[PDB]
Amino acid sequence: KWDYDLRCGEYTLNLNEKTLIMGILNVTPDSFSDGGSYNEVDAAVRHAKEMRDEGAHIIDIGGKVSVEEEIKRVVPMIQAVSKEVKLPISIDTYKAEVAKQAIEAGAHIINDIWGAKAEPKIAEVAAHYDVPIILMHNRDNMNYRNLMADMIADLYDSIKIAKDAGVRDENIILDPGIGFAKTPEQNLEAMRNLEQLNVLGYPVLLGTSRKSFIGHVLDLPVEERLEGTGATVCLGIEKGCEFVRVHDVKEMSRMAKMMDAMIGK
Amino acid sequence: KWDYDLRCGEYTLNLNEKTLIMGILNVTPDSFSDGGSYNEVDAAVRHAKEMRDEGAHIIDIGGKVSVEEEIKRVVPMIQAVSKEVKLPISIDTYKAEVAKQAIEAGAHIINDIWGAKAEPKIAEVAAHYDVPIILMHNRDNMNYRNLMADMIADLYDSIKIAKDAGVRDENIILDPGIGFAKTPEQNLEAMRNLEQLNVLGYPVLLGTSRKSFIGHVLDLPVEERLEGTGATVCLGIEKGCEFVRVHDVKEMSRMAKMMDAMIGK
Numbered sequence: 001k002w003d004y005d006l007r008c009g010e011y012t013l014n015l016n017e018k019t020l021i022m023g024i025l026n027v028t029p030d031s032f033s034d035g036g037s038y039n040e041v042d043a044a045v046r047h048a049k050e051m052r053d054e055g056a057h058i059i060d061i062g063g064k065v066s067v068e069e070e071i072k073r074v075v076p077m078i079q080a081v082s083k084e085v086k087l088p089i090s091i092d093t094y095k096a097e098v099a100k101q102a103i104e105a106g107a108h109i110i111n112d113i114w115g116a117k118a119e120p121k122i123a124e125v126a127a128h129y130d131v132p133i134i135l136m137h138n139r140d141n142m143n144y145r146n147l148m149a150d151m152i153a154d155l156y157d158s159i160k161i162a163k164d165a166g167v168r169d170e171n172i173i174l175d176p177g178i179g180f181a182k183t184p185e186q187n188l189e190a191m192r193n194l195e196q197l198n199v200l201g202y203p204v205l206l207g208t209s210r211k212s213f214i215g216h217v218l219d220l221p222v223e224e225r226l227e228g229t230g231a232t233v234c235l236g237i238e239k240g241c242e243f244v245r246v247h248d249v250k251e252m253s254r255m256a257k258m259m260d261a262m263i264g265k
Numbered sequence: 266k267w268d269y270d271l272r273c274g275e276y277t278l279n280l281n282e283k284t285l286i287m288g289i290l291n292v293t294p295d296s297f298s299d300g301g302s303y304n305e306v307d308a309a310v311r312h313a314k315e316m317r318d319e320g321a322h323i324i325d326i327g328g329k330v331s332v333e334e335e336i337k338r339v340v341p342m343i344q345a346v347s348k349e350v351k352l353p354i355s356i357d358t359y360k361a362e363v364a365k366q367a368i369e370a371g372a373h374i375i376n377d378i379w380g381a382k383a384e385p386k387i388a389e390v391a392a393h394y395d396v397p398i399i400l401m402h403n404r405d406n407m408n409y410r411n412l413m414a415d416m417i418a419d420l421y422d423s424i425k426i427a428k429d430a431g432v433r434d435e436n437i438i439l440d441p442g443i444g445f446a447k448t449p450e451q452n453l454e455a456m457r458n459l460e461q462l463n464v465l466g467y468p469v470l471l472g473t474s475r476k477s478f479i480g481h482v483l484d485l486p487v488e489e490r491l492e493g494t495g496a497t498v499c500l501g502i503e504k505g506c507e508f509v510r511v512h513d514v515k516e517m518s519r520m521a522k523m524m525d526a527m528i529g530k
């Protein structure tokens with residue numbers, strides 16, 4: 001079905017073989033440093049190793065805050081993790097400068113929650129290093145004429161920005177942006193119609209992990225959202241998504257893997 | 266979508282509102298009794314209450330063994346559970362006599378793994394008490410021309426038997442019989458094509474809980490099959506099934522409920 005692989009420097013991600021698990025690296029900062037202190041950098045590295053041993057295929061790392069301050073926090077983490085853990089790293093930022101530094105520091109994928117719309121220059125950054133960029137759907141309002149049609153329209157605007165800066169088709173990944181700019185009921189409606197995103201011709205990443213719309217449905221707090229997260233991941237894989245972005249790697253890998261076998265992926 | 270409710274004597278099961286959870290009552294016998302001893306009957310009752318507090322909507326109770334011996338074991342359990350727990354009970358047997366006794370003892374649904382083919386008289390039993398009967402797909406071989414087409418053909422044979430004894434359409438429920446008469450890969454193939462069962466026009470029950478085909482996929486023992494069971498339940502609900510038969514009620518209820526909200530059930 002996909003006639004190429006995802007090229008991330010030293011690592012290759014095949015898109016046909018299995019659903020790919022992006023593990024959400026947790027980044028508890030030391031209150032006393034802005035730096036890359038020993039307690040935080042080590043907490044991260046250990047967490048990255050845990051997710052790798054659990055079945056993660058990508059480690060996702062994220063840093064109101066300034067550019068220089070986000071870079072200070074995130075660069076030492078990318079460095080330590082890239083050296084100590086053999087999986088591609090995505091940098092979860094919407095800032096062209098953060099993205100540059102992270103890639104230089106060892107990051108392999110750009111993960112942009114504003115889909116190149118907050119800082120269009122990020123698409124230039126991706127275009128130059130030749131890395132995959134994830135363009136997530138987002139906007140500053142909840143006023144939809146037709147949720148799905150608008151989401152596709154908005155994502156198409158991100159693609160135009162990425163392509164106009166030289167981003168190759170093969171390094172575009174899309175994300176419906178569950179939990180952003182959507183009421184709970186709109187979140188459920190995007191889940192239900194997720195397969196429509198496939199007409200755009202790009203691999204899709206789904207991130208639903210522990211989000212409040214699950215809490216809204218099940219009336220359960222964040223630490224109780226594992227079953228409802230797995231429901232989303234499953235329906236996500238059934239509707240053709242290539243990656244999921246999850247906190248509970250062990251559990252979701254097992255679900256993904258069972259889904260794949262059933263759907264014939 | 267369904268223009269009737271499932272009538273089980275004192276209880277009504279709506280089929281449009283949510284996916285219905287059938288909890289699998291566990292029945293550890295006392296080595297010293299054949300009877301309805303205090304340790305076993307009480308272990309059952311407590312388990313039934315637990316599943317009810319977890320979200321089960323039906324309690325499923327099951328007893329090489331003789332008719333009189335299966336009745337001795339199962340009747341005291343139905344009696345104690347029906348009195349102490351306010352949910353309909355299904356009796357998991359393929360024997361017309363067991364089925365009679367159980368219904369008399371308080372059981373509301375017949376659950377037949379041979380789909381009225383082992384003891385056709387069971388369909389007479391259901392026809393008389395006017396109860397729902399679950400006709401599960403089964404056979405004594407694995408020689409399929411076309412797995413799905415044959416499954417539908419075989420289930421249709423059960424329907425003919427049930428209907429010919431007077432069973433009303435509204436008390437027919439079908440079950441694809443995952444884990445019976447199918448290799449692992451055939452199990453996965455029925456999961457993948459489960460929606461085909463809907464053309465027969467009956468509510469479908471899916472039972473996959475902890476079965477070996479999950480172990481085959483994930484290489485995990487029975488007590489490690491929760492994530493892979495949830496995958497099946499989810500794909501099952503996405504493909505239109507009305508009931509699932511599960512051991513882990515708490516976890517699967519949450520998954521079901523999240524699925525329902527997403528699919529719009």
Ligand SMILES: Nc1nc(O)c2nc(CNc3ccc(C(=O)O)cc3)cnc2n1
Nearest residue numbers: 111134136175178179207208211212213
């Ligand atoms: N590519 C990608 N895809 C996502 O889905 C994503 N989500 C978040 C996290 N954002 C949220 C949003 C809403 C909620 C809530 O309502 O609870 C929680 C977390 C961060 N980076 C992300 N990156």
Ligand SMILES: Nc1nc(O)c2nc(CNc3ccc(C(=O)O)cc3)cnc2n1
Nearest residue numbers: 376399401440443444472473476477478
């Ligand atoms: N209606 C209904 N639907 C079922 O699916 C079902 N399954 C069993 C349990 N049978 C099995 C079969 C196979 C396996 C394995 O391979 O591990 C385990 C248990 C018992 N009653 C059942 N009743």
